[PDB]
Amino acid sequence: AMRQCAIYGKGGIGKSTTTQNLVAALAEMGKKVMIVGCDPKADSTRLILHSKAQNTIMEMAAEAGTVEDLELEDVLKAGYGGVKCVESGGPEPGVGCAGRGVITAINFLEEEGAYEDDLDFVFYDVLGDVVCGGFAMPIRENKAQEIYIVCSGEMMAMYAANNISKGIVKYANSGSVRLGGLICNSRNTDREDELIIALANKLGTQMIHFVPRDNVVQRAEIRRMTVIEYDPKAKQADEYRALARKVVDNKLLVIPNPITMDELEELLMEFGI
Amino acid sequence: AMRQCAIYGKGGIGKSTTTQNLVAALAEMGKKVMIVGCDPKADSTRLILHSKAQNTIMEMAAEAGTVEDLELEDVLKAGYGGVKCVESGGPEPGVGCAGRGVITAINFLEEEGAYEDDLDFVFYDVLGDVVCGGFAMPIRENKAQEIYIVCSGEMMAMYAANNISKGIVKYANSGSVRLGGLICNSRNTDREDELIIALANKLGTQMIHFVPRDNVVQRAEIRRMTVIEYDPKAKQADEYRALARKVVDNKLLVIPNPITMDELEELLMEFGI
Ligand SMILES: Nc1ncnc2c1ncn2[C@@H]1O[C@H](COP(=O)(O)OP(=O)(O)O)[C@@H](O)[C@H]1O
Ligand SMILES: Nc1ncnc2c1ncn2[C@@H]1O[C@H](COP(=O)(O)OP(=O)(O)O)[C@@H](O)[C@H]1O
Ligand SMILES: [Mg+2]
Ligand SMILES: [Mg+2]
């Protein structure tokens, strides 16, 4: 078996930094992991591959003729800890549907046998500002059973978490997609941990980890690495190791309870952020 | 004539706060303005209307039967300074296309004669994390001739500005949609103004104004008002008045020059943010 997890959240909140560092810690632990980038920014694998980014399935299919002319060994690339990496891509802005590459990529990976038994985890890194088209497909089509939402005390980040939760509820009658937890990516504000714990409780889930804001992230990313690889002794490395451990051990997967706008505003008012 | 302007940018960057405060300053100046909300969050008019939010065209059409059973006087609501307000709405998460309500709303407003000659400005407040579907329609279908992008020194906010610019270039052979400027909504970081000026120059536009981060915004919004209405003597009120004046006087509308990821990273590296 393998656990299929998707990391959702608003743009800029820390999905790709958190996912790649979490996955590096899992690989350091001995797990076999694949990352599938589902964000048109297409830089969700650069820290594993030590790269600028990664050429996308959409791009490679266009140069090869069809997606059928691609081989899995041409598209999947291995980096730190043997983590396997692939990027979906998407159409250029103003053209088509921004999420159409996610559908092409996930179907290609399934057909070409990328979901080999020795994998322990697959992580999809998914744009979450809209929940439609290919960005909704991991939920609609039962591709990611465990959704973890990266957020912060920022109202827009919590709004996005509630919006993604509504999409999970909408498809609860089919498949087995569930909310596994919230990950707080700190803005270095007071009581922020308590705020995200309270939001998780209202939704029916948990805060799986509070990730501190730490400048070592920027120093590692300037060098195209995870903190795990760049400085294994860093305090922040131990934070990602704690997050990875709790994801491995997590057994709470729920159909969430989305909240009203009044509840959100009451949370922010109360915690004085 | 009326000037048709759209405010784009990543989620949470300050589109709705900036737009409503800019428009309030325009109304204080004697201009007649309409705001059209084109973001599914649907709170783009609350500070003009002193409201929680505003019921959307999608919602009202569903309760009335069809969009044809709606009258313009039922949908448009006037608030501070006589500013007229309407919200598009959108489908619930996981269902349909998140931008489909924008198409319905703009077509309804055009057909029902909302673009009456005495209007001086229309502002569309548009989600900009993806440029597709209804969110691309103001550009694709020539609805907003003047695009102003709210951003900040945050890499994701500048990436979004570049992405929106690519969509403008894609439709430059038809209609007259142009980039009018960047608005820096400060994160209170050093040389941030210089950073956004440099980005604007690379794209071929200008920084039309640097909006400071000021807690009076939160104090005004807790009371469902613009800063213009809440505290007309505030320093921040004068900032929005300066922004409004420069939008009125702006004559630079360009087909922008999108930049590469290397150029963006060089900007951040250089300005040491
Ligand atoms: N815990 C953290 N501490 C410091 N910087 C962070 C942290 N998490 C994310 N960042 C920075 O935030 C920016 C955006 O993160 P990213 O993972 O690219 O967001 P997303 O993938 O959600 O768009 C990156 O520059 C990243 O280095
Ligand atoms: N200049 C500013 N100073 C202080 N707070 C701001 C400023 N601009 C925006 N905000 C706050 O940022 C948050 C998001 O702004 P908003 O306009 O709702 O973003 P968007 O419409 O782009 O999603 C709001 O809570 C708003 O009060
Ligand atoms: Mg990312
Ligand atoms: Mg808004």
Curated annotation (Swiss-Prot), chains A, B:
One matching Pfam family: Fer4_NifH
Assigned keywords, A-Z: 4Fe-4S, ADP-ribosylation, ATP-binding, Iron, Iron-sulfur, Metal-binding, Nitrogen fixation, Nucleotide-binding, Oxidoreductase
EC number: 1.18.6.1
Keyword presence, tRNA processing: no
Molecular-function GO terms, alphabetical: 4 iron, 4 sulfur cluster binding; ATP binding; metal ion binding; nitrogenase activity
Catalytic activity: N2 + 8 reduced [2Fe-2S]-[ferredoxin] + 16 ATP + 16 H2O = H2 + 8 oxidized [2Fe-2S]-[ferredoxin] + 2 NH4(+) + 16 ADP + 16 phosphate + 6 H(+)
Note describing how the cofactor binds: Binds 1 [4Fe-4S] cluster per dimer.
Chain positions recorded as [4Fe-4S] cluster binding sites: 97, 132
Biological-process GO terms, alphabetical: nitrogen fixation
Positions carrying ADP-ribosylarginine: 100
InterPro entries attached to this UniProt entry: NifH/chlL_CS, NifH/frxC, Nitrogenase_Fe_NifH, P-loop_NTPase
Binding site for ATP: 9-16
Job of this protein: The key enzymatic reactions in nitrogen fixation are catalyzed by the nitrogenase complex, which has 2 components: the iron protein (component 2) and a component 1 which is either a molybdenum-iron protein, a vanadium-iron, or an iron-iron protein.
Record-linked PANTHER family: LIGHT-INDEPENDENT PROTOCHLOROPHYLLIDE REDUCTASE IRON-SULFUR ATP-BINDING PROTEIN
Quaternary structure and partners: Homodimer.
Note: This subunit is associated with the molybdenum-iron nitrogenase component 2.
Name assigned to this protein: Nitrogenase iron protein 1
Organism: Azotobacter vinelandii
Gene name of the record: nifH1
